[PDB]
């Protein structure tokens, strides 16, 4: 059968235990060469629309956002024509999360963001060390799909370095093709995209924990002091 593997098995026998124990989980060859290629083509096609926009921060600061993240991005719901395979990816990611039942931490994943198709043009841009969700915006799981064929960080950098909270050892995740990455979006996983010296494509979706997200949105609305 085509990729990916049954989500139930992968999630319950890998992602879940892996996530609870490490908070960082890598699934290589998630969709296989055919699909990975297709989405890598939809993403480059999307990129060629020149539509991508500099990556933005939750609470913008410092001269420019480019001081924090040097990727250009675009959001995909996954049903856009020319992004049906990204939709496929997104649905696969969703299937894995769904099959983790309620065992991803204390999280009740009931939703996610659109896919953030990201691209570090490859001019040495990266993403300084950050926490995807440091304030409790609802993001509990960060899911990333890499589209970088034969990516050699020794040459093109672009390593996603994650610093699992409490440890003095960091994980170096190569933005390699067909690689699916999962890691707690909160403070447990500060991480950085090391300077990418080649075009680095990744598709990120953040899963939301019902309660924290519900409270994220409500608190977003207000400004309190």
């Amino acid at each position: 059968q085509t990729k990916p593997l049954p989500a139930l098995k992968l999630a319950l026998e890998y992602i879940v235990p892996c996530m609870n124990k490490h908070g960082i989980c890598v699934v290589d060859d998630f969709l296989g060469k055919e699909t990975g290629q297709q989405i890598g083509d939809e993403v480059r096609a999307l990129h060629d629309t020149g539509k991508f926009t500099d990556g933005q921060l939750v609470s913008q600061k410092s001269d420019s956002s480019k001081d924090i993240r040097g990727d250009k991005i675009t959001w995909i719901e996954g049903k856009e024509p020319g992004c049906e395979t990204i939709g496929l990816l997104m649905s696969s990611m969703d299937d894995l999360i769904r099959h983790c039942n309620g065992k991803l931490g204390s999280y009740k994943i009931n939703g996610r963001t659109k896919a953030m198709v990201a691209c570090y043009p490859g001019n040495g841009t990266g993403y300084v060390r950050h926490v995807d969700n440091p304030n409790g915006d609802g993001r509990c799981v960060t899911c990333i799909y890499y589209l970088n064929k034969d990516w050699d960080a020794k040459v093109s950098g672009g390593i996603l370095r994650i610093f699992p909270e409490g440890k003095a050892q960091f994980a170096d995740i190569e933005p390699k093709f067909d690689r699916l990455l999962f890691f707690w979006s909160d403070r447990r996983n500060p991480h950085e995209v090391q300077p990418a010296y080649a075009t680095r494509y990744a598709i990120t979706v953040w899963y939301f924990d019902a309660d924290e997200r519900a409270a994220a949105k409500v608190k977003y609305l207000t400004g309190e002091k």
Partner: peptide
């Protein structure tokens, strides 16, 4: 601080699982 480094996300267009 961290808030200014975190990857921006819409607070409005969430996809329901």
């Amino acid at each position: 601080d961290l808030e200014m480094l975190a990857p921006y996300i819409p607070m409005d267009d969430d996809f329901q699982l």
